[PDB]
Amino acid sequence: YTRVVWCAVGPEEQKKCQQWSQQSGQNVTCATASTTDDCIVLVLKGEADALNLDGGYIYTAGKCGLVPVLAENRKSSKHSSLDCVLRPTEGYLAVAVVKKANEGLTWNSLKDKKSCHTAVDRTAGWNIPMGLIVNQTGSCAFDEFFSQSCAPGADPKSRLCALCAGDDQGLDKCVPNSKEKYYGYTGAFRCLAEDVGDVAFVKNDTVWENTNGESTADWAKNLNREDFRLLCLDGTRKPVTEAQSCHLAVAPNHAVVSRSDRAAHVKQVLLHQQALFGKNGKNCPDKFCLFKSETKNLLFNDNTECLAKLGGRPTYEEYLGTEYVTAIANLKKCSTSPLLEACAFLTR
Amino acid sequence: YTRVVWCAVGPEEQKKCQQWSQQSGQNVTCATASTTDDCIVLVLKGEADALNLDGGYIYTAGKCGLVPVLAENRKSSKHSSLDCVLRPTEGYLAVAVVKKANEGLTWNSLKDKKSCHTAVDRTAGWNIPMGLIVNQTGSCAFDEFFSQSCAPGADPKSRLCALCAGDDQGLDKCVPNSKEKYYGYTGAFRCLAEDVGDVAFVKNDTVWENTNGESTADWAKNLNREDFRLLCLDGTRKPVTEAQSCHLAVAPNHAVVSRSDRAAHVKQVLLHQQALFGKNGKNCPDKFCLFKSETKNLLFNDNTECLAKLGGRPTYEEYLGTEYVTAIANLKKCSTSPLLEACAFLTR
Numbered sequence: 158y159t160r161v162v163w164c165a166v167g168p169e170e171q172k173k174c175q176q177w178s179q180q181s182g183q184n185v186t187c188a189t190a191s192t193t194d195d196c197i198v199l200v201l202k203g204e205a206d207a208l209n210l211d212g213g214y215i216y217t218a219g220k221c222g223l224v225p226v227l228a229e230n231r232k233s234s235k236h237s238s239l240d241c242v243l244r245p246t247e248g249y250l251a252v253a254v255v256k257k258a259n260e261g262l263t264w265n266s267l268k269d270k271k272s273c274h275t276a277v278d279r280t281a282g283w284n285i286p287m288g289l290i291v292n293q294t295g296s297c298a299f300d301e302f303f304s305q306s307c308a309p310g311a312d313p314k315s316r317l318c319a320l321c322a323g324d325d326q327g328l329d330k331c332v333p334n335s336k337e338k339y340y341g342y343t344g345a346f347r348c349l350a351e352d353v354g355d356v357a358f359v360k361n362d363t364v365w366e367n368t369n370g371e372s373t374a375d376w377a378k379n380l381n382r383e384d385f386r387l388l389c390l391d392g393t394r395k396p397v398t399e400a401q402s403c404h405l406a407v408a409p410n411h412a413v414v415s416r417s418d419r420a421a422h423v424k425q426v427l428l429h430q431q432a433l434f435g436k437n438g439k440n441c442p443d444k445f446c447l448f449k450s451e452t453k454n455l456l457f458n459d460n461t462e463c464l465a466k467l468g469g470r471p472t473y474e475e476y477l478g479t480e481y482v483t484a485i486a487n488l489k490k491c492s493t494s495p496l497l498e499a500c501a502f503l504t505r
Numbered sequence: 506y507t508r509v510v511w512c513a514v515g516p517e518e519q520k521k522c523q524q525w526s527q528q529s530g531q532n533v534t535c536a537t538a539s540t541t542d543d544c545i546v547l548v549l550k551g552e553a554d555a556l557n558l559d560g561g562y563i564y565t566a567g568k569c570g571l572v573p574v575l576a577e578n579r580k581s582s583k584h585s586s587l588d589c590v591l592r593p594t595e596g597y598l599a600v601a602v603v604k605k606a607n608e609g610l611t612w613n614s615l616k617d618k619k620s621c622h623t624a625v626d627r628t629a630g631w632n633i634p635m636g637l638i639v640n641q642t643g644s645c646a647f648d649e650f651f652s653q654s655c656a657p658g659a660d661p662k663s664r665l666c667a668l669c670a671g672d673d674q675g676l677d678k679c680v681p682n683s684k685e686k687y688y689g690y691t692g693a694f695r696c697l698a699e700d701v702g703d704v705a706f707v708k709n710d711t712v713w714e715n716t717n718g719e720s721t722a723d724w725a726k727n728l729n730r731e732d733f734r735l736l737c738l739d740g741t742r743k744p745v746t747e748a749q750s751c752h753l754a755v756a757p758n759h760a761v762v763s764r765s766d767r768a769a770h771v772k773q774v775l776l777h778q779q780a781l782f783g784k785n786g787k788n789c790p791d792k793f794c795l796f797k798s799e800t801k802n803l804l805f806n807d808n809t810e811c812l813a814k815l816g817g818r819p820t821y822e823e824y825l826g827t828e829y830v831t832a833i834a835n836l837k838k839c840s841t842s843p844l845l846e847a848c849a850f851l852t853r
């Protein structure tokens with residue numbers, strides 16, 4: 158138990174992880190499963206040590222006994238002097254994104270509309286919007302709010318997966334990993350852009366990164382960010398530049414989780430793996446780049462500078478925050494998770 | 506599914522249930538329908554979990570296999586050293602009410618007069634009076650005993666709905682929910698207090714709470730209990746103070762019902778929701794008051810202290826009393842309702 162076993166979600170993340178493994182000199186090793194839930198189970202079983210997770214998936218990890226180790230830190234706005242690994246994290250902005258053309262679409266008219274989600278149980282994709290919808294309507298029938306959606310991880314037969322497109326061969330529709338066309342921050346924005354859905358629940362950063370020649374890929378090549386607007390809670394629409402006052406909520410940053418008996422080991426190993434393969438480390442881009450992907454947002458968000466430290470060994474609760482923990486728990490009163498039920502049974 | 510789905514009857518109850526959901530953090534959720542019967546269908550099919558029913562409606566729910574969970578308890582007449590939840594449940598007094606200026610009018614000259622009813626199938630408004638009238642005239646022809654009525658829930662083409670006024674714009678005449686200005690205890694009494702009717706079938710408490718400056722509603726603002734008499738079975742009229750000597754019968758109190766499989770979960774959640782939002786709850790009146798209405802008697806009677814444990818898991822027969830069940834059963838021999846016929850096979 159000196160090798161750190163990384164859990165990779167789907168085959169695209171498996172490739173990057175294999176590459177990482179070789180260059181690490183087996184200091185880091187790979188297990189795979191097809192979903193993040195499946196990977197959380199591997200860590201519980203001891204068939205893997207760690208992966209990097211959306212705050213939403215950190216809630217599942219936490220309820221099953223896992224702890225946060227290090228957080229994603231992206232480019233800040235100020236305090237450039239302090240070292241990235243010591244520089245306090247900020248936390249992204251969950252926004253609802255429409256095409257300006259879609260006329261008279263506000264927060265207050267989303268009922269019966271078409272939705273694109275990162276995946277079920279992710280913070281910007283699901284917890285935040287569906288938390289607010291459920292609370293506003295006083296109804297747990299979130300599964301019938303949108304006429305149709307692509308929400309990878311949902312029931313593949315339901316209206317919540319109706320819009321999902323699968324891989325190149327239209328196969329594995331709605332499976333929550335990179336191979337599904339509309340999976341993730343990128344996939345959900347691409348679902349809005351190809352006008353398959355009226356609204357997309359992503360983070361502010363995703364909107365910028367795939368408009369005004371900022372991404373090479375074709376679906377996003379010619380996209381211009383005056384053709385997109387942000388929905389605000391009050392009802393108003395605002396330009397994508399207004400996210401600071403037209404966001405649904407502030408999300409905690411994606412973080413690495415492991416068993417509590419492996420945190421310190423995983424911490425120490427990953428700091429060293431960063432100094433090697435991070436943004437400004439000895440062997441990027443010479444050998445291998447840990448925070449860059451052949452496709453997009455594999456193991457870590459491409460927008461990641463470093464993995465940063467946390468204050469005083471925090472619980473998943475302390476990490477995510479009292480308020481976002483109450484919102485998730487409240488939304489989850491409307492659903493049943495076999496994973497959470499198992500974990501309640503075998504952590505009591 | 507930890508959420509309890511409450512069934513609100515009509516849009517005024519829906520607004521109160523949405524508030525309740527929000528302040529309970531989705532410990533409670535709202536389904537709605539236009540009528541109590543429709544809501545009993547929702548609970549049967551598991552689309553809703555519970556609602557608070559008049560004893561007449563508890564008989565319909567019981568025949569369709571639902572069980573009583575908790576009973577409404579009002580401020581006792583005597584001294585109770587016990588907590589409201591454990592204090593015994595008294596029962597309310599079913600009375601006939603008239604203007605005193607209606608000379609000649611007794612129990613014995615009711616035939617061919619104008620009646621106001623809380624609604625069809627309710628204990629005081631309907632099962633008590635009409636049961637005695639079918640018994641006493643020896644005829645099933647109770648639909649023609651009064652010349653005209655408001656009895657919300659009856660055939661809106663028949664004379665039983667002739668006097669019903671509906672809502673602001675007189676839409677939804679005779680629908681058995683609070684949009685109908687003459688619906689329920691409040692509505693039946695307002696019907697007598699604007700001389701649309703000659704007799705109103707309500708409970709003792711209804712007259713007190715709406716006479717002698719004791720409500721803010723304009724139709725009631727300037728009512729005097731001296732202007733009203735009570736009809737007794739002996740043929741005499743007495744004042745509203747003689748309710749104990751001048752009542753048609755004793756009604757079992759309104760009670761929450763659910764399916765047998767959700768009863769324990771619904772009991773646990775409600776006992777805790779009234780600790781928070783009941784008469785002496787931490788969060789009433791700052792956040793939400795479970796037993797107050799913007800209008801009147803929404804979800805619960807506004808004169809409800811707490812909801813109170815029953816005996817050991819009773820049935821609808823045990824809760825209602827063999828005497829009332831047989832009085833109801835004999836009145837239903839003269840009539841058919843869809844829900845009783847649909848469910849008849851369950852207990853035959």
Ligand SMILES: *[C@@H]1O[C@H](CO)[C@@H](O[C@@H]2O[C@H](CO)[C@@H](O[C@@H]3O[C@H](CO)[C@@H](O[C@H]4O[C@H](CO)[C@@H](O)[C@H](O[C@H]5O[C@H](CO)[C@@H](O)[C@H](O)[C@@H]5O)[C@@H]4O)[C@H](O)[C@@H]3O)[C@H](O)[C@H]2NC(C)=O)[C@H](O)[C@H]1NC(C)=O
Pocket residue numbers: 580581582583584585598709710711713714719748749
């Ligand atoms: C018909 O309908 C009507 C429904 O409105 C009924 O009228 C209502 O009846 C009740 C009484 O039956 C009234 O409510 C009472 O209000 C008093 C205070 O105003 C309240 O408190 C006293 O009662 C007992 C006495 O034992 C105790 O709980 C209290 O004692 C405590 O406090 C004192 C000091 O202040 C201490 O010394 C003691 O040691 C105790 O700590 C009080 O003395 C009553 O409990 C009760 O709620 C309603 O006001 C009245 N409603 C209206 C609007 O008029 C009527 O009963 C119905 N009739 C029938 C036959 O059912």
Ligand SMILES: *[C@@H]1O[C@H](CO)[C@@H](O[C@@H]2O[C@H](CO)[C@@H](O[C@@H]3O[C@H](CO)[C@@H](O[C@H]4O[C@H](CO)[C@@H](O)[C@H](O)[C@@H]4O)[C@H](O)[C@@H]3O)[C@H](O)[C@H]2NC(C)=O)[C@H](O)[C@H]1NC(C)=O
Pocket residue numbers: 232233234235237250361362363365366371400401
């Ligand atoms: C929404 O999402 C966007 C992410 O895609 C955010 O836009 C980015 O925001 C930062 C602004 O804080 C941009 O980073 C910049 O990068 C510069 C270097 O290339 C920085 O350094 C320069 O400026 C200062 C001078 O004071 C010094 O650090 C240094 O001397 C240097 O000259 C800039 O300071 C700046 O941070 C980033 O490029 C933006 N990305 C894109 C593609 O536009 C946006 O902030 C997010 N919105 C909210 C409200 O959070």
Ligand SMILES: *[C@@H]1O[C@H](CO)[C@@H](O[C@@H]2O[C@H](CO)[C@@H](O[C@@H]3O[C@H](CO)[C@@H](O)[C@H](O)[C@@H]3O)[C@H](O)[C@H]2NC(C)=O)[C@H](O)[C@H]1NC(C)=O
Pocket residue numbers: 528529530532778781
């Ligand atoms: C929504 O429902 C839940 C019920 O699931 C309420 O929270 C629960 O409330 C109980 C009793 O208040 C809590 O128990 C307390 O916890 C501590 C620590 O265990 C204990 O020592 C105390 O004596 C007390 O019993 C319980 O923790 C909690 N349960 C869960 C699952 O969170 C909540 O209050 C309800 N919210 C609203 C707004 O109604």
Ligand SMILES: *[C@@H]1O[C@H](CO)[C@@H](O[C@@H]2O[C@H](CO)[C@@H](O)[C@H](O)[C@H]2NC(C)=O)[C@H](O)[C@H]1NC(C)=O
Pocket residue numbers: 180181182184429430433
């Ligand atoms: C793999 O892990 C070990 C850390 O345990 C690294 O080995 C150390 O390397 C430095 C010089 O690079 C030595 O001075 C240390 O004494 C070594 N420690 C041990 C225990 O061998 C190694 O660098 C790592 N390799 C990669 C590719 O990350």
Ligand SMILES: *[C@@H]1O[C@H](CO)[C@@H](O[C@@H]2O[C@H](CO)[C@@H](O)[C@H](O)[C@H]2NC(C)=O)[C@H](O)[C@H]1NC(C)=O
Pocket residue numbers: 292293484487524527528792
């Ligand atoms: C659920 O929604 C309601 C309103 O839509 C929120 O409750 C309001 O919040 C304010 C500020 O905290 C309270 O003071 C008001 O009393 C509430 N208004 C109403 C109409 O109830 C509630 O906080 C939301 N819950 C969550 C978790 O966001």
Ligand SMILES: *[C@@H]1O[C@H](CO)[C@@H](O[C@@H]2O[C@H](CO)[C@@H](O)[C@H](O)[C@H]2NC(C)=O)[C@H](O)[C@H]1NC(C)=O
Pocket residue numbers: 639640641643
């Ligand atoms: C009216 O109701 C009375 C009861 O209030 C009925 O008389 C009872 O009938 C039962 C069986 O049918 C007898 O066993 C009891 O002895 C009677 N009770 C009393 C108190 O006398 C009567 O059948 C009803 N009559 C009509 C015409 O409906």
Ligand SMILES: [Fe+3]
Pocket residue numbers: 211212279280281408411
């Ligand atoms: Fe996220």
Ligand SMILES: [Fe+3]
Pocket residue numbers: 559560627628629756759
């Ligand atoms: Fe009643």
